[PDB]
Each structure stands twice: as C-alpha cells, then as structure tokens.
From a paper:
AusE (Mr 35,100 protein, 314 amino acids) and PrhA (Mr 35,121 protein, 314 amino acids) are very similar (~78% amino acid sequence identity) αKG oxygenases that both accept preaustinoid A1 (5) as a substrate to form divergent products through dynamic skeletal rearrangement. In contrast, PrhA first desaturates at C5–C6 to form berkeleyone B, followed by rearrangement of the A/B-ring to form the cycloheptadiene moiety in berkeleydione.
Similarly, PrhA-V150L/A232S mutant completely lost its original activity, and instead catalyzed the AusE-type “spiro-lactone formation” to yield 7 as a single product. Comparison of the structures of the PrhA wild-type and PrhA-V150L/A232S mutant in complex with 5 showed that C-2 moved closer toward the iron center in the double mutant (4.2 vs. 4.4 Å). Here A232S mutation pushes C-3 and C-2 toward the iron center through a hydrogen bond with the C-3 carbonyl of 5 to facilitate the abstraction of H-2. In the absence of Ser232, the A-ring of 5 is more likely to undergo boat-to-chair flip, which brings C-5 closer toward the iron center to facilitate H-5 abstraction by the wild-type PrhA. The steady-state enzyme kinetics analysis using 5 revealed that the two double mutants, PrhA-V150L/A232S and AusE-L150V/S232A, have similar kcat and KM values to those of the wild-type enzymes.
Numbering used by the authors:
A (entry chain B): -3 to 36, 40 to 81, 83 to 122, 124 to 198, 200 to 219, 221 to 269, 280 to 295
B (entry chain A): -2 to 0, 2 to 63, 65 to 273, 275 to 295
The structure:
Amino acid sequence: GLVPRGSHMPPRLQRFPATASADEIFAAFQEDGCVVIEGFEQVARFSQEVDPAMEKIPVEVTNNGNSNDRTKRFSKCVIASPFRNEIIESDLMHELCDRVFSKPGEGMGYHFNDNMVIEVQPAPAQRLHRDQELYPWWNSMGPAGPECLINFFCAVTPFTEENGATRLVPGSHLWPEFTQINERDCPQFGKIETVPAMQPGDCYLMSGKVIHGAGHNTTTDRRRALALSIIRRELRPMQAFSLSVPMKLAREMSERSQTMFGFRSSFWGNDGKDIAHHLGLI
Amino acid sequence: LVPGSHMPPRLQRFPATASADEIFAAFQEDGCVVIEGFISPEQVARFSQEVDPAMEKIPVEVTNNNSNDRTKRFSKCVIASPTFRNEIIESDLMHELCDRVFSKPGEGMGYHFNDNMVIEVQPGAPAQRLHRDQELYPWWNSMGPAGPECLINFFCAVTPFTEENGATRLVPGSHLWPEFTQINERDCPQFGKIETVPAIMQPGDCYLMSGKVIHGAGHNATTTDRRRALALSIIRRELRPMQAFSLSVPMKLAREMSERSQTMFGFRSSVQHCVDMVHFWGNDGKDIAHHLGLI
Ligand SMILES: C=C1[C@@]2(C)C[C@H]3[C@]4(C)CCC(=O)OC(C)(C)[C@H]4CC[C@]3(C)[C@]1(C(=O)OC)C(=O)[C@@](C)(O)C2=O
Ligand SMILES: O=C(O)CCC(=O)C(=O)O
Ligand SMILES: O=C(O)CCC(=O)C(=O)O
Ligand SMILES: [Fe+3]
Ligand SMILES: [Fe+3]
C-alpha cells in the first residue's frame, strides 16, 4: 500500500540511511540508476563558508534556455571551505566509488570531475539530460556500456517541489537506446515520467545514465546544492584542480584524496613515476 | 615489385608538402599513412642529440620472458629538447590533421597530448604483442568501427626504421573490421592469421595511425642497432593524458609556448559546447590560463 490500490505507480526511488550497507545502497543504485542517502551540521558550516563566494556571483535573467538562467554555480570549494577536510573523506563515498569503478589490483579507478555548488534562484526548469552527455560518445554505448560518471548530489537548502528540486527519472539507465532528450531525437519526449527528488546534508547518488533535470523554482527560496561528480580514471576532469588548488592544501590531504584531485597517480604519471614524487609528497 | 608472389598490404606514403586533405583521405581509407619528412633531417638529428643524454642514463631492462623489455621509453621531451618544444610540436601539418580528426564546429581544439615518448628498441628486443592503441581506453573497442576516434599517433623515425631492426608492424584497414576485440587466442578468431606490414622509414619520416589500427613493434634482429622513435600521442579533449604535463613541465617553459601549445599540455583550456558551454579542464568558469598567468 504505497500508492492507492489501482493507481499507476510512479518510478521507484529507494532511500537508505547514511549508515546503510554499501552493497545494499549499491544494489539499489544498479536497480534504479539512483538512490537517496539521507544524512550524507557539517552542511551548515559548509554553506556559511561558501556563502561569501556565492554572494559575489551576479545572477543573469536571460530566458535563453541556458543552464545559467537564474542558476548560480561555484566550483572552488576546496579553496573556500575547510569540505576539503571533512566532507570529501566519507569512507562510504569511496566505498561506493570503488564498487562502481575500481578493478581488483588496479587500486582507485576513479577521481574527481567537479565540486560544484548549484543554487537555483527563484528560474526556468533545466533541460532534461543525462550527465554522461559530457562525454559525447558515451550514450552511443547504450545501457550495456560501462559507467563513466556518478554524482553525489547533496542538498544545502532543502529540496521542495516548490524551490525546483531535481526531477529524476529512475530506470532511464536501462532504456534500449540512449538519445538526446528533445522532441526530434527522443521518441518519448513529453511522456517521460519524472520523480522530483530532500533535507540539507542528504545526497542522492545518481548514475551518469539517468535522465534528470532541475525544475522550475517560489519568491524567496534560493535552493542551494553541492554536486560531487566522480569519473573514471581514464577521463578528463572539467576542473583543473591540481593547477588551481594550492600545494599548501594538497599537503594536508590524504593519499587517496590527492589522487582524487590529481596530485597523485595510480594515467597522469611523470615519465614512469608517480607525479607525487616530483611535487614533493613522497 | 615482387615476382604469382603474394602482394602484402599497401601502406600509403606522401611527402610532408602534400595537402592535409590528401593525407587525411588516405588516413581515413587505411587508418595509417606515412608522412615523409614530417620532421626535417636537421631537426631530427638535433632532437636525437638533445635527448641522447637522457637516453643514455636509462638502463636497458632484460628479464626472463613476452613482456616488451629491452625498450627504452622517455617522456620528458619538452624539458630536454628545445628543438622539440620550439619546432616539432609546432608542426602545422600535425595540427591541420588533428583538427580534421578531433575538432568539432565552434568548440576550439578538440585534442591535446596524451604523451611525447621516445621509444628506443634495443638490439634483440622481442616483438610486441599486436594491439590497438585505443585499448588504453578499455570501453572504446565496444563501439567498434562506427565509434568516434579516441586517439591518433604521429610515430616518427628518429633513426632509420628497417624490417630487421624492428620497425612497427601495421595492419592497414583493421580500423574497419566489424568486431574490435583484444588480439589473443580466446577473443580473436584471426589470431596467428593476421597479415602485418612494416613501417619502413628514414629519420624524420613518421606514420600517422588511428587508435583503431592493430599494430605492434617488430623484433629487433640486429646486434648493434638501437631503433629510436618519437611517439606523439594525441587524444580527444575529454580523455585523460598518460603524462601529467602541466605538473612536471616548468612554467618558465609554459610561458614560451604558443597558445595552441599551451592547450596541448593543459596550461590552457578548450571550450566544449553541449545549449550550454563549458571550458574543459577549466577553473570555476574561467580559462585556467588566467590563474597560471598566461593571459
Ligand atoms: C556546461 C555544462 C555541462 C556540459 C557540464 C555540467 C556538469 C559538469 C556535468 C554533469 C555532471 O555530471 O556534473 C555536474 C552536476 C557537476 C554538471 C555541472 C554543470 C555543467 C558545468 C553544465 C553548465 O553549467 O552549463 C553552463 C550543465 O549544466 C550541463 C548539465 O548542461 C552539462 O552537461
Ligand atoms: O541543479 C540541479 O538540481 C541539477 C544539477 C544538474 O543536473 C546539472 O547542472 O548538471
Ligand atoms: O615501437 C613501436 O614500433 C610500436 C610501439 C607501440 O605501438 C606502443 O608502445 O603502443
Ligand atoms: Fe545534471
Ligand atoms: Fe601501440
């Protein structure tokens, strides 16, 4: 008795506590392409730390169909928030990444693509898209292809259906053909059943194959999010973290986090040697 | 020609003064093309000389094995060779050809360096296993010949490439087979039945090869011939390089690069359009070359 008996049931979107087993969350990730992780205070210290840089972002009102139309985005999160000390060291984050990406005896098969705070000003709904469209050939491999990208999308201010929270399409990672989602390329355009995604500090772990998009935003609510995009070791990051994150901060990171930001190798080597030698990190 | 004698596969040859369009058409037909005089004889000789000290401090590895040993590999070419960083990577024919492969309309350079590797095959080095270079990106074969290009290689003769000294063995038109598998006994049904052809080249000649082309370094059946090559490996802007050039190449040398050379090594971003635009390998909305100081 989850929907009134006889009702059409909407797409399934499982929810796990931040204390749940990694293999339990992972089976739900494979089943639907996305899961919620409730509980993934630290969220408050972070928002306050990033709030000044947020305030120095002017808003554009363009009615252009762009993703910048009344949506604020900021990436220098390691520079701006002592995040770089607590948030990225989730032993469950790595627990999941290592199940999605790593192979036995290659160590870490993953690293960071971006660390982005997204704040939808009260803004047209984002176009529906797969994240893996960032690597434009991936869709051509269809649902049999390997994962390139997963996203720990974390709520900062709460996610109402009013402030424009992300609308996810669970199960779109198993559709036979992966297309652009528009009226010309997507036969299912307009019949696509979305499910809106949430309280601060909770994260939904989404595959790069799942259709989704930010909805329309209210009068007062700036709905703020924090995206942890993590990609295959073989793919290139959107952010050049090891060129803009200062060496002072890289020295305080763990071996595994230096790898996530490319201050360390596992690809991205230095003539047969780990790049961390030449940088002075033993 | 040969005498009813079987005729081995055709590897096309062009001079470096041929138009990029004629070379590219042959590249598309066959997946590989020789560009003669890709580098001048005087440039190759100066490059060979400028890296030779580094090439002499590299110990030859000999092992008890089928593991691509007795092959020196050196990648600090920008640091060690002014002829390389000031002249070789500024080949316009190289960039002309890279655009025809990689660059989408209105998104700038679609490509950057994966590696710059001197490969010196020692006397007696065993032959390499037949392989496609895009096996580096393990999912790529699964898109088969319809797939987009992962990488191309400008593989230049620094010293002569002969059949005896281990010039690369190529399989022209293997970029067009219907199934791309690893080349082993379990997965490849033509295993042991694959016809190769060597890349016979003088110094400064190069071949240009798709990642979809099966190939392998031959066996060096000489006693005194160290067969040297310079591999300029070039990948799509969305793929990760094997060398972290922006972290080991010094900024002194970065400031003396053209903007397109800076982009090749990750000292500068390229802008991909998806509705939306995004500087790839950027800095929170801006080109990374601002924070690095390159303007
Ligand atoms: C330009 C855009 C790209 C190409 C990349 C994308 C991306 C890195 C990719 C999806 C992912 O996995 O991670 C996150 C959530 C961090 C996003 C963050 C936002 C941007 C930078 C982007 C944008 O801001 O447009 C001006 C978009 O909104 C979007 C979805 O259209 C894109 O595909
Ligand atoms: O802003 C959101 O809620 C979704 C983020 C997203 O999908 C993107 O920008 O890529
Ligand atoms: O050295 C050669 O001729 C071939 C080298 C090669 O193909 C490789 O190392 O990938
Ligand atoms: Fe998205
Ligand atoms: Fe090769």
